[PDB]
Design a protein around this ligand. Structure first.
Ligand SMILES: *[C@@H]1O[C@H](CO)[C@@H](O[C@@H]2O[C@H](CO)[C@@H](O)[C@H](O)[C@H]2NC(C)=O)[C@H](O)[C@H]1NC(C)=O
Ligand SMILES: *[C@@H]1O[C@H](CO)[C@@H](O[C@@H]2O[C@H](CO)[C@@H](O)[C@H](O)[C@H]2NC(C)=O)[C@H](O)[C@H]1NC(C)=O
Ligand SMILES: [Cu+2]
Ligand SMILES: [Cu+2]
Ligand SMILES: [Cu+2]
Ligand SMILES: [Cu+2]
Ligand code: NA
Length: 499
């Protein structure tokens, strides 16, 4: 069952064995992935998060981010630790009480403390549209049509060296998959379809690191949504999906009744499909209960290319049709050395006082804000351009902006910008050496918004900055509840911190 829009959510420790290997985890709702939180566009969500964690090896504090939801007027509910709140301590709870006006699509939720989401705190978050413009393109859209792709580690996250190339031990599709070494024939996920019906498959990357080459033998996939943004129909036979991205695609169950492999090949870790790694099963009703015998092609003839995507609505691009053609044009210097990432020369290390609380206490320019050099102010009601030139080790880096989606004016592996009709999204691969992936948005959402690589190991190694958008209006725009004001006193008391 789906839960929400008003629900409790308990965060607990438990042993799980999604690839046959038992390890302790940090779980929402007792499962990996966590339960789907859902509602309709414009609903009030009130997710009362109960921190019941006791195992210090995965951290007993927590904080949860609602990935891709803009949080306009509710910056305090966004979730990134030490940017918008102090963590929730064990034995306490916190009501994330917000609204989702003007958004409908496929999202997700995850811990936003350290690398804790890698240890298991990740699940889908769907905002349905009762008047969806894509409704006539499919028959079925429900919890059974959500497909999650996850990396899974046998080593606990707080034992992963900072700044290291950290590699997974299994790919999990809907919570199940097989280990790359010591492979056992543990259960594979099954996605069941009825011959003749059309399905809205909601593909969610809940990855902490790898990108996946996703395909379904014998089938193609018609993209209709990108990171919450409705798209024109684009038919492909393979989707390369980076960490934190989402796609909806129409799956037409138009092949003979049978069993077909679902494939998700990560860029690191186990390569191929030996022993059923990197795999799940598409089963038609009436098929024999047996593994597929299908083959992938040697090459995919119609892979997704990001510049092929275009919004369904006439979204256009803000600003002027050239580089620097914005009110506030920025170029970030993104670098890596000696185990640490930096942005504009500064490696991110979380501050003691959350950025939002520093601003509510009266600090009102970005040079007054901590961490020093990690906060950039943005002016209100202005077109912002951010160029993100690649080259830093550990790529391709999927950059994500909180509080906003953005036009992808230039994509990976293509030097040509698009000022007319590029897709809008919230997480974008910045590509490879010499690329100049560039994003644009307008500043109509006061508050501190994190910008970071969504490979969680890279965020932990400092690959982040904070956009303090419209500092002067942050306090009036974002009234805070008493329970939020109580978080930092409680957290600092529990950890013997003086602030
Ligand atoms: C990426 O595009 C940005 C512009 O969006 C380029 O920024 C210019 O950089 C040069 C020095 O390299 C400066 O003289 C200009 O002031 C910058 N802004 C402009 C021209 O609008 C940046 O060089 C590009 N990077 C790469 C690697 O192609
Ligand atoms: C490289 O990106 C550019 C810009 O998004 C793509 O150019 C567009 O190509 C479409 C499809 O043919 C034309 O309708 C547009 O007029 C082009 N726009 C511009 C600004 O040139 C281009 O197709 C991409 N390259 C590849 C190989 O896909
Ligand atoms: Cu996220
Ligand atoms: Cu986010
Ligand atoms: Cu990265
Ligand atoms: Cu974030
Ligand atoms: Na325009």
């Amino acid at each position: 069952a789906q839960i929400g829009p008003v629900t409790d959510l308990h965060i607990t420790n438990a042993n799980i064995s999604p690839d046959g290997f038992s390890r302790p985890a940090v779980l929402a709702g007792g499962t990996f992935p966590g339960p789907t939180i859902a509602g309709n566009t414009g609903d009030n969500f009130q997710i009362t998060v109960f921190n019941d964690l006791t195992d210090p090896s995965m951290l007993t504090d927590t904080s949860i981010h609602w990935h891709g939801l803009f949080q306009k007027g509710t910056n305090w509910a966004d979730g990134p630790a030490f940017v918008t709140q102090c963590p929730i301590i064990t034995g306490q709870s916190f009501d994330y009480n917000f609204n989702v006006p003007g958004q409908a699509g496929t999202f997700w939720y995850h811990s936003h403390l350290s690398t804790q989401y890698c240890d298991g705190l990740r699940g889908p978050f769907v905002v349905y549209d009762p008047n969806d413009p894509n409704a006539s393109l499919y028959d079925v859209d429900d919890d059974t049509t959500i497909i999650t792709l996850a990396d899974w580690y046998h080593t606990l996250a707080q034992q992963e060296p900072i700044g290291a190339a950290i590699t997974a031990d299994a790919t999990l599709i809907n919570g199940l998959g097989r280990s790359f070494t010591n492979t056992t024939a543990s259960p594979l996920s099954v996605i069941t379809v009825q011959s003749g019906k059309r399905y809205r498959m909601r593909l969610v990357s809940i990855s902490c690191d790898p990108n996946y080459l996703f395909s379904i033998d014998g089938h193609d996939m018609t993209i209709i949504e990108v990171d919450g943004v409705n798209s024109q129909q684009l038919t492909v036979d393979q989707i390369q999906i980076f960490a934190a991205q989402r796609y909806s695609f129409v799956l037409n169950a138009n092949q003979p009744v049978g069993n077909y492999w679902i494939r998700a090949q990560p860029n690191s870790g186990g390569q191929g499909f030996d022993g059923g790694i990197n795999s799940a099963i598409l089963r038609y009703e009436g098929a024999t209960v047996e593994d597929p015998t299908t083959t992938a092609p040697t090459t995919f003839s119609n892979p997704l290319v990001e510049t092929d995507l275009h919004p369904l609505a006439d979204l256009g691009v803000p600003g002027q049709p050239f580089r620097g053609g914005a009110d506030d044009p920025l170029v970030l210097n993104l670098a890596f050395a000696n185990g640490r990432f930096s942005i504009d020369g500064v490696s991110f290390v979380p501050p003691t006082v959350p950025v939002l609380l520093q601003i509510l206490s009266g600090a009102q320019n970005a040079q007054d804000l901590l961490p020093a050099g990690s906060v950039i102010s943005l002016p209100s009601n202005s077109v912002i351009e951010v160029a993100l030139p690649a080259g830093a080790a550990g790529g391709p880096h999927p950059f994500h902006l909180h509080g906003h989606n953005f036009a992808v004016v230039q994509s990976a592996n293509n030097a040509t910008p698009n000022y007319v009709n590029p897709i809008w999204r919230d997480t974008v691969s910045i590509g490879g050496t010499g690329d100049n992936v560039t994003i644009r948005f307008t500043t109509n959402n006061p508050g501190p918004w994190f910008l970071h690589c969504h490979i969680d190991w890279h965020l932990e190694a400092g690959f982040a900055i904070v956009f303090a958008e419209d500092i002067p209006d942050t306090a009036s725009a974002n009234p805070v509840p008493q329970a939020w004001s109580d978080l930092c006193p409680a957290y600092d008391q529990a950890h013997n911190i003086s602030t």
